[PDB]
Design a binder for this molecule. Structure first.
Ligand SMILES: Nc1ncnc2c1ncn2[C@@H]1O[C@H](COP(=O)(O)OP(=O)(O)OP(=O)(O)O)[C@@H](O)[C@H]1O
Ligand SMILES: [Zn+2]
Lengths: 286, 191, 39, 94, 139, 50, 287
């Protein structure tokens, strides 16, 4: 239903500072808060957020509290200072998908119809993007209990804004791999993207570990996609795909040959522009 | 005035479903809640009163507020039907008591039982010594009908005012459908 | 191409001062800016 | 059963395994394409069909060993090919 | 660091920008414009402008206090837009004019026939007319 | 009420005039180009809600 | 007294709050409140900023409702953690930064509460990347200006490091208020999680980029690159001629083939090589 999301650095830091301001609890706390923003053109947007007062105990871990007085009053304030701004969903700090995050969404679904969640990271280390968002469905299959409230991950990305890029680029001042030439693609996706294939490669290997040892659900709805992958594995070197390849490339290196061929003539013309500069400078200057 | 925050736990379980008490059980304990929040409110303007239940779905129907009109509106057509779950009533009380406005306030809860309980006394003695280690003073007032003589309740309040607590109370239900105001005339006079 | 880079970087020599703008014109800019600030 | 090497079969083999005549198997496989349990093409003159996609079925705890092993050396191709990019492309990015 | 300072200068562009018109340049990287306030000035440039987007009558951008070149503009006029083409073509056919065979075919030669078949005027080279005048009694 | 009627003018003397202009064309979403009934042509931005 | 070595520390979030709320209602002078720990006589560490909604239409600074900041002060008290109000701000939008006569009044209403309150001006237009422009201020007593006496008694080479702007020098600059050198507090906990997340492709370079139109676009550059090279066979030939400064001023009306050429050589080069190598890795990786 909703295509993808847009997340700002303001909300991105604006969870982490709250994790600091409850960071004096020491023992254990998750950061849970209310996510605010709009969505237009079936593109989700996230602009602002805050956090709800919240506690939890491990013994009888089916008890949670969201102060709706704080919710109504503070969102009334945010509506008052910005009527354009509104509710969009929620977020929890999300290390590993806590258990109450199946009916928190049911607790606050009366506010937003597509009451969406956001899982973030407070210990940032990965080779990907540590921002996650699911969506609520209660989809029905064809075996066992039908209507099952399973969250489903819609794709996610960090959105920019012309206002906030001044502050972001100001707060970097650290490293910036611009001059995007023949190098920046090699590292933004050719070095790094293979490691992007490494983790998704290793993930199904980790799921695979139930061979006779792991959890109880065997396959049913996992192996049609895997069987579809191994059926969908590409063509081997026999056909014209080789000769179209060879044939293909062979066309591209022509254009490479022309471009490199003109570049040397350009630099040689600059050398003549240099000779004229130094010669008619030696006898004239002295 | 004196620092507390009154947290009432209402009983919307499925054994609250007759007119044995004269107007309505719901209206009777409802107006009891009204006059005890007049007592706590008019004895202390700082005290706020919100309501929780200990049924299957322990919902915060009203957020903890010094208002009473939302409390009245939710107690209108509250639909007291569902399976009681008392063992999570302790956690859904105390965790909100950690959610309260200030820990300078006295941890005081009133708890309403008008249904048969299926708890273990081991479970409420783990939660009871949990309330000992958390220093929590709850006076439980029984309503409606009950397993006679509060089975596990005397042991619970005993394991609540035990170890120099000795100030917590357990008002049992008299099994006669009378006007409950004189039934609760003792804790409102002296806790 | 690279040899046409390596054997042509000689040129940059001789000339050695790129002045910012001036000194006395900077002082006169401070005086005229001081008069605009006084105005 | 047929691997991804060929997965290409003949109407003689279909006539054997279903023991039905030559002039019915085409009407069978057009029905199979109509249901969409299988996806492939039909050549008539060489009497062979190029089956590409099949309906995904279920399997026991034995085929997951095969998919495990096919996964396993598929990992080290990514390792080995990626290591050329790391080692050789090292001076382009520190 | 040169990439950092490279973007740093363009804060001067910003918003509160007034409009003049480019006239000519004295030298490399210093020029002469005419403000739409009416007066002309001897102004400085901004470095990152492609100078080959200037030509003659360029609409330029001027800083509201320092009064120097800022940015080049896509062209603008208010005298008229461009005859907006939807509710703008007066419903009038060529057949609505009767008895103007000389002048209709003649202005057809004068205007749109060099607009389309330019290579005949160039190829034979008969110097197609720049502007046309038409007159007579009214109506 | 006499302090109220004068209290209208207590803060009512703070509105500042608005230059009457005219839209020429539109460069970008935020880059606009106008000219008043006074003189020169300007480059201008708008409120983000209007 | 002070030593003009005050050194305000702020945050890594409040800058974002200032630019967002200062940018959303930008042509009106929006404002709000500042909220952080007040450390010693020299420094201050303002960790948080919440904004205040306006009073009505009109370019000014409106007023402050202590009902509203009394409540909002307590929302974080009963939810997050207690802090202290230290300063406040407004927004000269595209002006630069100074104190107006209206600004100095509402400042003067705040310094009487706490003597080390802070005036702050954000300018969310003239900032681009390295120029954020804030320059927090505070009043100086005009009584000592009547005394003819110099305040603020410099004991450290820390004050006169930034030269003041000429427009604030036209304004009350040094006769009614002073500047404060500020900086920022940050950590790798934030630096990594904003660097690693801002501009990230996912698997996009592991694609093929419109495989019919790649060679077609390659044609679509080379075709006019021919005639542009004919112009390079035009523009060299007026050397051994008039001086290159005239060959510098004279080339401001018509395009040159040189720079325009070496642009397109780069575009064809990096356009081709990425599609080549990225095309060839998948042959190994996928079967
Ligand atoms: N075929 C025609 N030839 C000449 N006149 C015609 C024809 N058909 C209609 N007319 C009339 O002649 C008039 C021509 O209008 P038009 O405005 O072009 O006149 P004009 O020559 O421009 O005179 P003026 O300059 O005074 O307007 C029209 O009002 C129309 O009524
Ligand atoms: Zn101001």
């Amino acid at each position: 239903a909703v295509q993808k999301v847009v997340v700002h650095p303001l909300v991105l830091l604006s969870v982490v500072d709250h994790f600091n301001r409850i960071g004096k609890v020491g023992n254990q706390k998750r950061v849970v808060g209310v996510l605010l923003g709009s969505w237009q053109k079936k593109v989700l947007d996230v602009s602002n957020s805050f956090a709800v007062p919240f506690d939890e105990d491990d013994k009888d871990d089916s008890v949670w509290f969201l102060d709706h007085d704080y919710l109504e009053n503070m969102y009334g304030m945010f509506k008052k200072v910005n009527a354009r701004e509104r509710i969009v969903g929620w977020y929890h700090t999300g290390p590993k998908l806590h258990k109450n995050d199946i009916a928190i969404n049911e607790l606050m679904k009366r506010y937003c119809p597509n009451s969406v969640l956001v899982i973030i990271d407070v210990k940032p280390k990965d080779l990907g993007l540590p921002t996650e968002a699911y969506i609520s469905v209660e989809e029905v299959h064809d075996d066992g209990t039908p209507t099952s409230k399973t969250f489903e991950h819609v794709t996610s990305e960090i959105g920019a804004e012309e206002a906030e890029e001044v502050g972001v680029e100001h707060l970097l001042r650290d490293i910036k791999d611009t001059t995007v030439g023949t190098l920046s693609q090699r590292i933004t996706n050719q070095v790094h993207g293979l490691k992007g294939l490494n983790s998704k490669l290793l993930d199904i290997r980790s799921y695979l570990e139930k061979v006779a040892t792991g959890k109880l659900p065997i396959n049913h709805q996992i192996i049609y996609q895997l069987q579809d992958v191994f059926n969908l594995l590409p063509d081997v070197s026999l056909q014209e795909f080789v000769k179209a390849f060879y044939l293909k490339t062979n066309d591209q290196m022509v254009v490479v040959y022309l471009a490199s061929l003109i570049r040397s003539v350009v630099a040689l013309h600059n050398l003549i522009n240099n000779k004229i500069a130094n010669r008619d400078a030696e006898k004239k200057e002295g | 005035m004196v620092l507390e925050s009154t947290m009432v736990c209402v009983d919307n379980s499925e054994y609250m479903r007759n007119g044995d008490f004269l107007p309505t059980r719901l209206q009777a304990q409802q107006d009891a809640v009204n006059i005890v929040c007049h007592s706590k409110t008019r004895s202390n303007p700082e005290n706020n009163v919100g309501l929780i239940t200990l049924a299957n779905d322990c919902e915060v129907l009203t957020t903890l507020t010094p208002d009473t009109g939302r409390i009245l509106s939710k107690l209108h057509t509250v639909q007291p039907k569902g399976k009681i779950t008392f063992c999570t009533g302790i956690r859904v009380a105390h965790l909100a008591l950690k959610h309260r406005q200030g820990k300078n306030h006295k941890m005081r809860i009133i708890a309403f039982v008008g249904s048969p309980v299926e708890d273990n006394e081991k479970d409420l003695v783990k939660l009871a010594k949990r309330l000992k280690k958390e220093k929590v003073n709850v006076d439980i007032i029984n309503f409606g009908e009950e397993e006679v003589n509060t089975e596990k309740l005397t042991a619970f309040v005993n394991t609540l005012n035990g170890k120099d607590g000795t100030g917590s109370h357990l008002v049992t239900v008299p099994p006669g459908p009378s006007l409950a105001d004189a039934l609760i005339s003792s804790p409102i006079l002296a806790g | 191409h690279n040899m046409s880079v390596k054997a042509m970087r000689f040129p940059p020599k001789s000339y050695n001062k790129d002045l910012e703008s001036a000194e006395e014109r900077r002082e006169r800019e401070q005086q005229d800016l001081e008069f605009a600030k006084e105005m | 059963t047929r691997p991804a090497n060929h997965r290409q079969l003949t109407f003689e083999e279909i006539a054997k395994s279903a023991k039905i005549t030559v002039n019915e198997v085409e009407l069978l496989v057009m029905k199979a394409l109509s249901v969409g349990l299988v996806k492939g093409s039909i050549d008539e003159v060489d009497k062979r069909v190029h089956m590409t996609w099949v309906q995904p079925r279920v399997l026991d705890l034995q085929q997951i060993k095969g998919m495990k092993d096919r996964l396993e050396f598929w990992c080290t191709d990514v390792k080995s090919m990626e290591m050329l990019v790391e080692h050789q492309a090292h001076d382009i990015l520190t | 660091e040169f990439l950092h300072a490279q973007e740093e200068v363009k804060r001067i562009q910003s918003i509160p920008l007034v409009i003049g018109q480019f006239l000519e340049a004295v030298d490399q990287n210093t020029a002469i414009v005419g403000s739409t306030t009416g007066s002309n000035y001897y102004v400085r440039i901004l470095s990152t402008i492609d100078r080959e987007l200037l030509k003659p009558n360029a609409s330029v951008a001027l800083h509201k206090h320092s009064n120097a070149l800022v940015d080049v503009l896509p062209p603008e006029a208010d005298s008229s837009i461009m005859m907006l083409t939807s509710d703008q073509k007066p419903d009038v056919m060529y057949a609505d004019i009767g008895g103007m065979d000389i002048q209709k075919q003649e202005v057809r030669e004068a205007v749109e026939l060099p607009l389309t078949h330019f290579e005949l005027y160039k190829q034979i080279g008969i110097d197609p007319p720049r502007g046309v005048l038409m007159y007579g009694p009214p109506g | 009420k006499q302090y109220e009627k004068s209290e209208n003018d207590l803060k009512a003397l703070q509105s500042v005039g608005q230059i009457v202009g005219e839209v020429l064309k539109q460069l970008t979403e935020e880059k606009f180009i106008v000219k008043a009934t006074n003189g020169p042509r300007y480059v201008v931005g708008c409120r983000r809600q209007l | 007294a002070v030593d003009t070595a005050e050194q305000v520390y702020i945050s890594s979030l409040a800058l974002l709050k200032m630019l967002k709320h200062g940018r959303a209602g930008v042509p009106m002078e929006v404002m709000g409140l500042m909220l952080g720990e007040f450390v010693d006589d020299y420094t201050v560490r303002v960790i948080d900023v919440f904004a205040m909604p306006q009073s009505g239409t009109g370019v000014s600074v409106e007023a402050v409702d202590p009902v509203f900041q009394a409540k909002m002060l307590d929302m974080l008290k009963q939810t997050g953690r207690p802090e202290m109000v230290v300063g406040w701000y407004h927004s000269h939008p595209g002006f630069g930064c100074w104190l107006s006569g209206v600004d100095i009044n509402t400042q003067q209403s705040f310094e009487a509460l706490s003597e080390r309150a802070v005036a702050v001006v954000v300018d969310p237009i003239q900032s681009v990347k390295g120029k954020v422009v804030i320059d927090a201020f505070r009043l100086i007593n005009a009584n000592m200006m009547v005394l003819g006496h110099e305040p603020r008694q410099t004991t450290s080479n820390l004050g006169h490091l930034n030269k003041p702007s000429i427009q604030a020098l036209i304004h009350g600059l040094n006769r009614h208020y002073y500047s404060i050198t500020i900086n920022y507090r940050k950590n790798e906990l934030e630096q990594k999680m904003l660097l690693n997340l801002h501009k990230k492709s996912w698997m996009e370079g592991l694609t093929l980029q419109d495989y019919s139109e790649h060679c077609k676009h390659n044609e679509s550059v080379v075709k006019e690159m021919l005639e542009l090279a004919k112009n390079y066979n035009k523009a060299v030939e007026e050397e051994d001629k008039m001086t290159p400064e005239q060959l510098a001023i004279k080339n401001v009306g018509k395009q040159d083939p040189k720079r325009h050429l070496e642009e397109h050589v780069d575009v064809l080069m990096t356009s081709n090589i990425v599609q080549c190598l990225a095309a060839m890795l998948d042959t190994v990786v996928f079967k």
